Design a protein around this ligand. Structure first.
Ligand SMILES: Nc1ncnc2c1ncn2[C@@H]1O[C@H](COP(=O)(O)OP(=O)(O)O)[C@@H](O)[C@H]1O
Ligand SMILES: [Zn+2]
Lengths: 48, 286, 273, 191, 84, 70, 68, 94, 188
């Protein structure tokens, strides 16, 4: 997760860097909590 | 003014379906719909169309109803689906325009100032060009004549988009002629051209008969453009033209003769080879 | 009972043209739309008409089946005089091949919920190259029947002539979840002729004459090629104990061109005087 | 509570350009359509109303829509520079009414006659006979300068429904300062 | 090059920023296919030096043990010029 | 039908096409071509192209979908 | 899909360099304002249509952030 | 009034009709061509002015009747040749 | 929203009146065709165009770091007044250079190729480039001082590509007025 956009702390958005594929602005799935996903750590993203 | 109106196959298929849908139960004259498309420098490209519920009365030739809100929200839906399509005219299946059509064309002009109405004769299938594009014009008629609405004609043609092109070609797949032409189809094209010229001359002669007999008023203008047709005749049998024509006919005939000789020699060689082969087989059998 | 392999979908010419046009327009993004018509009987699915729906960010999925647009368009088309019922849905798979993905599977069961015999139609627009329309129709088979020693669909006749399906469907599990429905385009005679009106040459084209200054150059060129071909043919025939085919093709071209030009010239000379 | 479709016919001829009623007949007729459509729609919210103009044309600016707002919208900027053609106005009103979306709503026509009607007696009586044969109720109300209690109009409403019918009224308005209170006492409450 | 641009942008965001580029011999090597990418990085750095001009608060200090390896284009005039 | 088949054959080598490098001929109507995409493909060859123009280095144009040399 | 606008040309149109190292052209710039845009901007565009969906604030790499 | 086949005009007829000298017909037809009502050409050794037309005029009932008779002749010729072509080319037609 | 982006490509070669070879900026090269209402004259080898992403047809053309990122070294607004104590030198520069700029036709009048090599040899840091910028601003001519990259010729790393860059980058694209870096390197 390259950066936390944090538009309004309700739809925060998350800039992630997929190694060499690309970089994207995604949101977490409902399974995980926003406080559990800090900026800079590595996370698993769905392929779709 | 508009130079051209190129009509896609989708709109003509849609108007065919609309007329079949309405006339299957509601035996009625022209059915009215709206034609959408994209503009250009000056040439319109009609791409999609829809049907608007319309009613008419043969009495007073003005008791009609084409819905306003229906047109508006069909366009809303179509623009939501595809915003590139703009209202550019309307269509009716009637072979002839009615006295009523002026009001519908003004109503369409309220939605598009350069609105062009396309007559699509779904019922008849004939020589060609089933679409006739007409534009309302308003002028003092220059040469001092009483003014009226009038529908100036604009030329039309049938073009196709690549997806529509593959769709229609696969849709036929049983009567599509070879694009290479070959002699039979070129000769049929020539016969079709002769038939079309005869039909056009017959229509023009009928119009001239109507004008001369008084059943139609003398236009006094455009009629002399038909006179310009009459002047444009090449006047064959001129000596220079005859000599040039014979020269080029012989120039083509020598090539035809050379090709025929080539073919005859090839056929003779093939026959010699076949005779040699069958004799070889006969003698090798023993 | 179980459906039959003889079941087929009748797509009107207008419906097919609309679906292909929408698929090309929405490329590269995937589009979708309802398929108005009537089932009529058990063995037929008449797709009279199809209308496109606004594209949503979720792609081809159930949340992109907005009921306001569908209901308004349905009732209002029926107001115009088109009272058909939804028989399925078409959607676009550009460069993917005609097959159903998992999301398509969810959409197809959602469609089967209200209409048991709904059909999912897949069109590949970019793959629909000139002279080849890649279109397929599917309907889901639930695991319950096929697992329980039951054939997904009975072949009561020989209409299973549908050739070996594209292997792309096999990799994407064609027969595992969605049996394909054989296709049969329905074309009327009016629409056939008025689609023929597209490429039909005008009457002025038959009587027109090719540029004489161009015809002479074409004759010169082809005759010189025929000269080289005659040299090759002489060498080949002498050294015997593909000049022939090339020579025959050149002769066909020359003869048809010159004969057509000459006949057009004569017709023009007689007609216009 | 009765299901019905109201097909109002307003006027924007040049004869509405004299201050016989109120500031001018335009606002008088606008408020008249306002109150009549209000009565019809609060009487039954499942109904629907539309408007046809009559000045030299017959436009369907608002079709048969339950939302009165569109009718109020197109009632504005009417630009009274036309001429009344009553012969085709009622014909187009019925031809739009036959486009009814609901098949249980009842017929009801209101037309705003503010100008004298130039129609043949035989034409209007055959129009009324056709309305009888098609079961359409029409209420005609007269404003402004007009031959008071028109014989043609009274015969038209008499043969609109004869032999103990519902009684489609031919309402006239008192010249001068007068609202549609008389037009709502008798006609609006009972048709 | 993206790293150089982002570092310079971060220096811009803070008003009193000091950039310190250590071991300039790595990316300041004279040009002569990783040479292409190294050239892209060095030219991005050069463009960043050519960017600010109104005596902005962003100032840069470069340290190196070798000057012969260093690209003479880095010195120039509008770039690192104080050869201390 | 033969004229139609020839028309389809011509339609095969239609715009768009992908440039590749003709790596090596394998046999009649079969070869290996290195496409500009960055991968090498074992593809077929149309009979229309003369077999003498396929130099082991000359560039060729292949069908976009099937990558076949056209 | 984040991208850098290489330049904006008139004919209101923009050239986009996606993070997939692919350069596309855009006759229309999308749902943001052309005036509030300049070369080098970071914008999140659609993954399929490659149309600029949103403008993005300047972003610093993790190494750049740790550089401070 | 020319019969549309012998469109060439001699000098003497122009001189006797417009009652002008034979040295002025040349300049007169030059002026008419320059204005934009004639698109012919001028000869001098034979002094026959070649004639082509791009400037039409108003018609009349008798003129319309005659010219529609000419058009009927034209269409009859077209129909006759079309019939001959289809009859001779029946087998090749397909 | 209904609009869809188009790939940016470079036209390598013109095949026919309707066939072009276009290579994507970071992709393979395709044989494509023009859309329709485009000037094929504008489509020359070296122009930036916008291919449609599905049919690959050239929808439109586009105007066109790099090594030239150190090539330019434009003169600036240095004028005669800034340079002091080079009156004879300034007159020499005028007498040498202004004729090829102002009056190239006099050389044809006498019939001789213009003089190319003019050596303003002298200590560095004394205003050589200042004199050149001063005369350039006097004629407002773009002084493209050579910064090696995109103009290196003698540099033995590459033989003919460097020649191509030397020629094409200057003179052809940028009108005239050149210089050279490493002022004493190749002279010796
Ligand atoms: N005549 C002059 N007037 C003013 N400043 C000068 C003059 N000559 C030299 N300078 C100064 O000295 C420097 C000259 O450098 P220059 O001779 O251009 O070096 P090089 O020719 O090696 O590039 C400039 O920075 C300039 O400010
Ligand atoms: Zn799908």
């Amino acid at each position: 997760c390259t950066k936390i956009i944090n538009a309004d702390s309700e739809d925060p958005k998350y800039i992630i860097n997929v190694k060499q594929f690309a970089k994207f602005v995604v949101d977490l799935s409902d399974q995980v909590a926003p406080t559990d996903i800090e900026e800079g750590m590595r996370v698993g993203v769905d392929r779709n | 003014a508009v130079q051209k109106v190129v009509v896609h196959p989708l709109v003509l298929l849609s108007v065919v379906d609309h007329f079949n849908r309405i006339g299957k139960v509601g035996n009625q004259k022209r059915v009215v719909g709206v034609l959408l498309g994209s503009w250009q420098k000056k040439v319109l490209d009609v791409s999609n169309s829809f049907a608007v519920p319309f009613d008419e009365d043969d009495k007073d030739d003005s008791v009609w109803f084409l819905d306003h809100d229906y047109l508006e929200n069909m366009y809303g839906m179509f623009k939501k689906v595809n915003a590139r399509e703009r209202i550019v005219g309307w269509y009716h299946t009637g072979p002839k325009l009615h006295k009523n059509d002026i009001a519908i064309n003004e109503l369409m002009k309220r939605y598009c100032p350069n609105s062009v109405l396309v007559i699509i004769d779904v019922k008849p299938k004939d020589l060609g060009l089933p679409t006739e594009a007409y534009i309302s014009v308003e002028e003092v008629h220059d040469d001092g004549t009483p003014t009226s609405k009038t529908f100036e004609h604009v030329t039309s043609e049938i073009g196709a988009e690549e997806a529509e092109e593959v769709g229609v070609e696969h849709l036929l797949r049983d009567i599509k002629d070879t694009t290479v032409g070959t002699l039979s189809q070129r000769i049929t094209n020539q016969v079709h051209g002769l038939k079309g010229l005869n039909s056009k001359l017959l229509d023009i002669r009928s119009y001239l008969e109507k004008v001369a007999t008084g059943k139609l008023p003398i236009n006094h203008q455009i009629i002399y453009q038909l006179q310009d047709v009459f002047n444009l005749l090449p006047d064959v049998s001129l000596q220079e033209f005859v000599k040039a024509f014979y020269l080029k006919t012989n120039d083509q005939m020598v090539v035809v003769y050379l090709a025929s000789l080539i073919r005859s020699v090839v056929a003779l060689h093939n026959l010699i080879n076949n005779k040699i082969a069958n004799r070889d087989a006969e003698k090798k059998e023993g | 009972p179980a459906v039959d392999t003889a079941e087929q979908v009748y797509i009107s010419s207008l419906a097919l043209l609309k679906m292909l046009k929408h698929g090309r327009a929405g490329v590269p993004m995937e589009v979708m739309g309802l398929m108005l018509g009537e089932f009529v009987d058990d063995y037929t699915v008449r797709v009279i008409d199809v209308f496109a729906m606004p594209q949503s960010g979720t792609g081809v999925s159930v949340e992109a089946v907005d009921p306001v647009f569908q209901a308004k368009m349905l009732d209002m088309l029926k107001q115009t005089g088109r009272p058909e019922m939804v028989v399925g849905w078409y959607h676009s798979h550009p460069g993917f091949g005609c097959w159903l993905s998992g999301v398509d599977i969810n959409t197809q069961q959602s469609f089967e919920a209200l209409s048991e015999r709904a059909v999912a139609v897949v069109v590949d627009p970019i793959q629909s190259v000139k002279g080849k329309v890649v279109i397929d129709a599917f309907r889901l088979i639930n695991a319950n029947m096929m697992v329980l020693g039951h054939e997904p669909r009975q072949t009561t006749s020989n209409l299973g002539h549908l050739n070996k399906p594209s292997i792309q469907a096999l990799i994407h599990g064609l027969n595992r979840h969605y049996y394909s429905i054989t296709i049969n385009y329905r074309k009327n005679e009016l629409e056939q002729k008025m689609l023929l009106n597209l490429h039909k040459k005008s009457w002025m084209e038959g009587l027109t004459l090719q540029d004489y200054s161009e015809h002479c150059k074409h004759n010169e060129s082809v005759v010189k090629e025929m000269l080289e071909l005659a040299k090759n043919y002489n060498k080949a025939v002498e050294e015997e104990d593909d000049p022939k085919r090339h020579l025959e093709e050149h002769v066909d071209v020359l003869m048809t061109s010159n004969i057509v030009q000459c006949l057009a010239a004569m017709l023009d000379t007689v007609v216009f005087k | 509570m009765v299901l019905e479709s109201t097909m109002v016919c307003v006027d924007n001829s040049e004869y509405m350009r004299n201050g016989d009623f109120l500031p001018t007949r335009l606002q008088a007729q606008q408020d008249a359509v306002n109150i009549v459509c209000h009565s019809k729609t609060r009487s039954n919210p499942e109904n629907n109303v539309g408007l046809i103009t009559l000045a030299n044309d017959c436009e369907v600016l608002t079709t048969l829509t339950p939302d009165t707002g569109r009718i109020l919208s197109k009632l504005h900027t009417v630009q009274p520079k036309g001429k009344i053609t009553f012969c085709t106005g009622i014909r187009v009103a019925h031809l739009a009414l036959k486009h009814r979306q609901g098949k249980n709503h009842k017929m009801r026509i209101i037309a705003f006659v503010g100008s004298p009607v130039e129609d043949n007696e035989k034409d209007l009586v055959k129009l009324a006979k056709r309305l009888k044969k098609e079961k359409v109720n029409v209420d005609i109300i007269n404003f402004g300068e007009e031959e008071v209690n028109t014989e043609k109009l009274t015969a038209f409403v008499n043969t609109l429904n004869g032999k103990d019918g519902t009684g489609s009224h031919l309402v006239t308005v008192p010249p001068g300062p007068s609202l549609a209170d008389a037009l709502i006492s008798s006609p609006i409450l009972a048709g | 090059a993206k790293l150089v641009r982002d570092a310079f942008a971060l220096a811009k965001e803070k008003a009193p920023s000091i950039i310190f580029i250590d071991e300039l011999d790595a990316i300041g090597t004279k040009r002569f296919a990783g040479d292409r990418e190294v050239q892209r990085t060095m030219l991005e750095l050069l463009n960043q030096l050519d960017g600010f001009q109104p005596n902005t608060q962003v100032k840069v200090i470069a340290a190196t043990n070798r000057v012969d390896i260093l690209d003479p284009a880095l010195l120039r005039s509008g770039r690192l010029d104080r050869k201390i | 039908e033969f004229l139609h088949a020839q028309e389809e054959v011509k339609r095969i080598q239609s715009i768009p096409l992908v440039i590749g490098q003709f790596l090596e001929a394998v046999d009649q109507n079969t070869a290996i071509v290195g496409s500009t995409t960055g991968s090498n493909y074992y593809v077929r060859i149309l009979s229309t192209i003369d077999r003498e123009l396929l130099k082991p280095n000359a560039s060729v144009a292949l069908h976009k979908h099937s990558n076949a040399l056209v | 899909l984040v991208s850098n606008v290489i330049e904006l040309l008139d004919v209101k149109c923009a050239v986009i360099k996606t993070s997939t190292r692919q350069t596309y052209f855009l006759p229309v710039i999308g749902l943001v304002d052309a005036e509030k845009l300049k070369p080098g901007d970071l914008v999140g565009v659609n993954k399929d249509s490659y149309l600029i969906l949103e403008t993005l604030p300047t972003e610093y790499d993790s190494r750049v952030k740790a550089m401070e | 009034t020319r019969p549309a086949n012998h469109r060439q005009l001699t000098f003497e007829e122009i001189a006797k009709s417009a009652k002008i000298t034979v040295n002025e017909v040349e300049l007169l037809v030059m002026k008419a061509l320059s204005v934009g009502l004639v698109k012919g050409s001028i000869d001098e050794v034979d002094k026959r002015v070649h004639m082509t037309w791009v400037q039409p005029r108003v018609l009349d009932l008798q003129q319309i009747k005659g010219m529609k008779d000419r058009l009927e002749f034209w269409c009859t010729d077209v129909k006759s040749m079309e019939m001959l072509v289809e009859h001779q080319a029946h087998d090749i037609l397909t | 929203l209904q609009s869809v982006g188009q790939i940016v490509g470079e036209v390598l070669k013109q095949l026919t009146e309707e066939k072009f070879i276009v290579k994507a900026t970071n992709g393979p090269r395709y044989v494509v065709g023009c859309r329709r209402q485009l000037d094929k004259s504008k489509l020359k080898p070296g122009t930036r165009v916008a291919l449609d992403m599905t049919t690959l047809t050239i929808m439109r053309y586009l105007p066109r770091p790099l090594v030239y990122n150190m090539s330019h070294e434009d003169p600036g607004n240095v004028s005669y007044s800034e340079i002091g104590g080079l009156s004879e030198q300034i007159r020499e520069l005028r007498e040498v250079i202004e004729l090829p700029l102002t009056n190239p036709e006099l050389f044809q009048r006498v019939g001789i190729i213009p003089p190319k090599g003019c050596l303003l040899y002298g200590p560095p840091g004394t205003g050589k480039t200042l004199l050149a910028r001063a005369v350039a601003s006097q004629l407002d001519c773009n002084f493209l001082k050579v910064v090696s990259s995109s103009i290196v010729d003698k540099y033995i790393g590459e033989s003919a590509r460097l020649i191509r860059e030397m020629f094409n980058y200057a003179r052809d694209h940028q009108p005239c007025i050149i210089f050279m870096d490493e002022i004493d390197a190749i002279g010796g």
